[model samples]
Target chain A: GPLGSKQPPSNPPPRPPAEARKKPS
Target chain B: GSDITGPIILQTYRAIADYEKTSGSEMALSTGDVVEVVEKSESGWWFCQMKAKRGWIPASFLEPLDSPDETEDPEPNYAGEPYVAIKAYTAVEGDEVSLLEGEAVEVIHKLLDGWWVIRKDDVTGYFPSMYLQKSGQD
Candidate 1:
């Protein structure tokens, strides 16, 4: 069920900020 | 011990004669706070302060810390154009080099220089400068 199974992509919309993250080296 | 006053941003403010004074009342500040000198003495001693949790940093450090204010504005999104990594081990002949975070570089040429030319850590490198348009520049 919802316990160990992966959640559907629709569950969380893609976030632009998250996608464009840049960490200092 | 000179006369110490506040509400200063931090306890350290009392150490330096010259500290930063912020535009707003609160010591803590966000990115775009205007900072200036609040007090100074004839002997070249001064008091500077800023809008940060630790307000009134030494004037010597202010020039380097607040250099962004002197130059062009900040561009949050400027990744569309071609970019090169300044710290990359190797770069192609015509490849543009992107300035590493906190690295200081200058633009020497335009077309031939691509767009931006950053002297990474003093190593002369070229990159696409226009891709990242500064806030206030021609």
Candidate 2:
């Protein structure tokens, strides 16, 4: 289905705070 | 009747701590600030309304006024609760759905892990509960 276009990663990133939108340096 | 348009009193609470927001959906609260309780989660986090802002806060930080507080065992509620995304989030996994800040959505499941299943249109996916603010409708 189109919804599955972006497959789940083997290891998704850890749950982050809302401010974590910007990637860290 | 009194000649006044003052605010009507309801089930209200006062902030005991100067709780600060750790996320966009959490409101920055000041000590002694008064707020109206919107919803309560089994995890002790509460959706509240203060001034023009609405967000989640720890129930432990609230001081009830002439009433007792209670927490119930939470279960998945299929009847969705109206909520608004307080922050934009891109779907990192296929199981998740992207959301725009301020987008209206309905919460179908409130997971214990802080990830909730929200429905936008006919699509449903996992969204971080910290990024959602309850609309507080009856």
Candidate 3:
């Protein structure tokens, strides 16, 4: 991996809040 | 006459006190004791030096002494209930941010229309008020 880079790489996928995933069906 | 203030409740204890008194030199002070605000800085910083130690404690942790000559009450009106967290979105400005569970924050002022100006510990910043459904009037 390159040490210094001006533009950062794309971020990983976002995760929802813990409560949001536990919503009742 | 005794300086009995009233029935005091033991709130969140400080971890630093335990670390300092590991040798049992001041075990009694390990339990957070209710202390009076002897003095305060002009910039609103309190200078409450614990009786056990020489270091100063933040005035935010102390309850104002209820006396007849007391001016404005500094105690926050908590409404005698816990603030429940609501499902809402809050935009994070800085790189690293966290919304800890059971974090105590009070909405003081607001910007960006109805958005909130929250103060947590010593950090006072703005957050989306619509995201918070806590029980204090705006």
Best by DockQ: 2
Error of 2 at B125 (Å): 0.8
**Second chain TM-score, each model:** 0.23, 0.47, 0.28
Total clashing pairs in model 2: 0
lDDT of all predictions: 0.32, 0.64, 0.35
Candidate 2's C-alpha runs over 4 A off are: A1-25, B1-72
Clashing pairs in 3: none
TM-score of chain A of 3: 0.26
Give the DockQ of candidate 1.
0.01
How close is each model in CA RMSD to the real structure?
A: 19.4, 14.6, 17.3
Which should have the higher TM-score, number 1 or number 2? 2
Best to worst by TM-score, what's the order? 2, 3, 1
Q: After best superposition, candidate 2 residue B59: deviation in angstroms?
A: 17
lDDT of 1 by residue, A1-25 (tens): 4675321111111111222234211
Q: What is the lDDT of candidate 2?
A: 0.64
Which lDDT value does model 3 have at B66?
A: 48
DockQ of every predicted complex:
0.01, 0.03, 0.02
Q: What TM-score, computed on C-alpha atoms, does each candidate reach?
A: 0.21, 0.42, 0.26
- Per-residue lDDT tens digits for candidate 3, residues A1-25, read 8875222112111222233336422
